Enzyme design. Structure first.
Site, PDB file in Angstrom:
ATOM      1  N   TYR A   1     -11.895   5.884  35.593  1.00 31.53           N
ATOM      2  CA  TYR A   1     -11.573   5.852  34.175  1.00 31.53           C
ATOM      3  C   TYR A   1     -10.083   6.010  33.888  1.00 31.53           C
ATOM      4  O   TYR A   1      -9.345   6.622  34.660  1.00 31.53           O
ATOM      5  CB  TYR A   1     -12.269   7.003  33.435  1.00 31.53           C
ATOM      6  CG  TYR A   1     -13.728   6.834  33.116  1.00 31.53           C
ATOM      7  CD1 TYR A   1     -14.709   7.043  34.086  1.00 31.53           C
ATOM      8  CD2 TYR A   1     -14.132   6.512  31.823  1.00 31.53           C
ATOM      9  CE1 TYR A   1     -16.065   6.940  33.766  1.00 31.53           C
ATOM     10  CE2 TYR A   1     -15.481   6.405  31.491  1.00 31.53           C
ATOM     11  CZ  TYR A   1     -16.439   6.621  32.467  1.00 31.53           C
ATOM     12  OH  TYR A   1     -17.766   6.512  32.132  1.00 31.53           O
TER      13      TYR A   1
ATOM     14  N   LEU B   1     -10.717   6.440  26.033  1.00 28.84           N
ATOM     15  CA  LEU B   1     -11.499   6.486  27.262  1.00 28.84           C
ATOM     16  C   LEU B   1     -11.956   5.082  27.652  1.00 28.84           C
ATOM     17  O   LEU B   1     -12.631   4.398  26.881  1.00 28.84           O
ATOM     18  CB  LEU B   1     -12.717   7.397  27.077  1.00 28.84           C
ATOM     19  CG  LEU B   1     -13.541   7.698  28.329  1.00 28.84           C
ATOM     20  CD1 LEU B   1     -12.665   8.354  29.393  1.00 28.84           C
ATOM     21  CD2 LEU B   1     -14.700   8.606  27.956  1.00 28.84           C
TER      22      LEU B   1
ATOM     23  N   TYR C   1     -18.392  14.805  34.239  1.00 27.07           N
ATOM     24  CA  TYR C   1     -18.238  14.827  32.788  1.00 27.07           C
ATOM     25  C   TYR C   1     -16.750  14.785  32.474  1.00 27.07           C
ATOM     26  O   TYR C   1     -16.049  15.789  32.611  1.00 27.07           O
ATOM     27  CB  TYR C   1     -18.866  16.098  32.207  1.00 27.07           C
ATOM     28  CG  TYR C   1     -20.371  16.142  32.360  1.00 27.07           C
ATOM     29  CD1 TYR C   1     -21.189  15.299  31.611  1.00 27.07           C
ATOM     30  CD2 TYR C   1     -20.974  16.995  33.286  1.00 27.07           C
ATOM     31  CE1 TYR C   1     -22.575  15.299  31.778  1.00 27.07           C
ATOM     32  CE2 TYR C   1     -22.361  17.002  33.460  1.00 27.07           C
ATOM     33  CZ  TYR C   1     -23.152  16.151  32.705  1.00 27.07           C
ATOM     34  OH  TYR C   1     -24.520  16.142  32.878  1.00 27.07           O
TER      35      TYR C   1
ATOM     36  N   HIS D   1     -29.317  -2.162  32.409  1.00 23.50           N
ATOM     37  CA  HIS D   1     -28.004  -1.693  32.804  1.00 23.50           C
ATOM     38  C   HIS D   1     -28.244  -0.621  33.855  1.00 23.50           C
ATOM     39  O   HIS D   1     -29.392  -0.332  34.193  1.00 23.50           O
ATOM     40  CB  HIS D   1     -27.197  -1.177  31.603  1.00 23.50           C
ATOM     41  CG  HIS D   1     -27.802  -0.005  30.908  1.00 23.50           C
ATOM     42  ND1 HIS D   1     -27.935   0.052  29.534  1.00 23.50           N
ATOM     43  CD2 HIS D   1     -28.252   1.181  31.375  1.00 23.50           C
ATOM     44  CE1 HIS D   1     -28.439   1.219  29.193  1.00 23.50           C
ATOM     45  NE2 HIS D   1     -28.642   1.928  30.292  1.00 23.50           N
TER      46      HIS D   1
ATOM     47  N   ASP E   1     -20.658   5.765  27.583  1.00 24.18           N
ATOM     48  CA  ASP E   1     -20.377   6.397  26.294  1.00 24.18           C
ATOM     49  C   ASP E   1     -20.042   5.344  25.240  1.00 24.18           C
ATOM     50  O   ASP E   1     -19.138   4.530  25.426  1.00 24.18           O
ATOM     51  CB  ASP E   1     -19.213   7.375  26.467  1.00 24.18           C
ATOM     52  CG  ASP E   1     -18.756   7.997  25.163  1.00 24.18           C
ATOM     53  OD1 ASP E   1     -19.450   7.866  24.137  1.00 24.18           O
ATOM     54  OD2 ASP E   1     -17.686   8.634  25.174  1.00 24.18           O
TER      55      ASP E   1
END
Length: 278
Positions: free
Chosen positions: A69, A164, A143, A36, A41
């Protein structure tokens, strides 16, 4: 085990680790080589590009790419992880105004600094009661939980992530993402039709050069590509005036490797698909 080149844009299941997702995809494609381009996460869902075969050589170009995101935050509660799974550590009333929200959000747009970076776009989706939904398009190294935690403090009520999802990495089309379920359904469909699974699975892959999508494409005629593939710089019109480029050859645009405009302005080979001879 077979040599298959390309990139599978997996929609990672919520909770699954990137490594487990990688192993499952590698097995489904029976690839001899897979990796990958950065762990997503485990608690997030969304795009997890899985490079197969030669595509792995160009993984680095996705690692430093931009990401987008969709995030939903719970306002009024700060948690000991900055996310849903965990107990509340500090709860406060949500009293900020719409104008205060707009102002706080604007401080997270553009070049910013973090201490748990560029936010190209911070889309306000909605704010209703204790929920704030946003879309964040940012540079690598950002972050997300820290943005939400800092935003929560700036708003004076605190906040933590409850949802998320990585919508995309680089310029990959969100609609080209595929789920593990869909992959399994295609495997059954192939077995059912008595045809190789590859026949239905391979069309889902993005090109092996796609990890370097952030860089322009320069096509070379075969008369020039031979020199380039032998490790020598070549002149070409069209080639940018600076930076890395994806280099292809011939009428079919066969990818032969990464090139970089050198001092003279020629396209010099940087990371070829083929190896240099002794």
């Amino acid at each position: 085990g077979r040599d298959i080149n390309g990139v599978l844009l997996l929609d990672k299941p919520q909770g699954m680790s990137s490594n487990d997702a990688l192993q499952k995809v590698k097995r489904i494609y029976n690839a001899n080589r897979a990796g990958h381009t950065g762990a997503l996460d485990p608690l997030a869902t969304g795009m997890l590009p899985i490079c197969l075969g030669e595509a792995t050589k160009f993984s680095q170009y996705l690692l430093d790419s931009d990401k987008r995101y969709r995030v939903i935050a719970r306002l009024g509660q700060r948690t000991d992880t900055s996310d849903a799974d965990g107990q509340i550590v500090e709860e406060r009333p949500v009293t900020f105004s719409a104008e205060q929200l707009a102002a706080a959000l604007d401080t997270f747009r553009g070049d910013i600094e973090q201490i748990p970076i560029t936010v190209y776009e911070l889309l306000f989706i909605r704010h209703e009661g204790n929920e704030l939904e946003l879309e964040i398009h940012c540079s690598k190294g950002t972050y997300i939980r820290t943005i939400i935690d800092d935003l929560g403090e700036k708003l004076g009520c605190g906040a933590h992530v409850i949802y998320l999802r990585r919508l995309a990495v680089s310029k990959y089309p969100v609609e080209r993402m595929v789920t593990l379920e869909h992959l399994r359904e295609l495997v059954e469909q192939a077995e059912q039709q008595d045809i190789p699974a590859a026949e239905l699975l391979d069309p889902l892959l993005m090109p092996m050069d796609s990890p370097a999508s952030d860089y322009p494409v320069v096509n070379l005629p075969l008369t020039s590509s031979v020199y380039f593939k032998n490790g020598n710089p070549v002149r070409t019109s069209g080639a940018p005036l600076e930076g890395l480029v994806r280099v292809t050859e011939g009428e079919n645009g066969k990818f032969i490797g990464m090139g970089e405009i050198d001092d003279e302005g020629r396209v010099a080979p940087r990371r070829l698909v083929v190896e240099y001879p002794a």
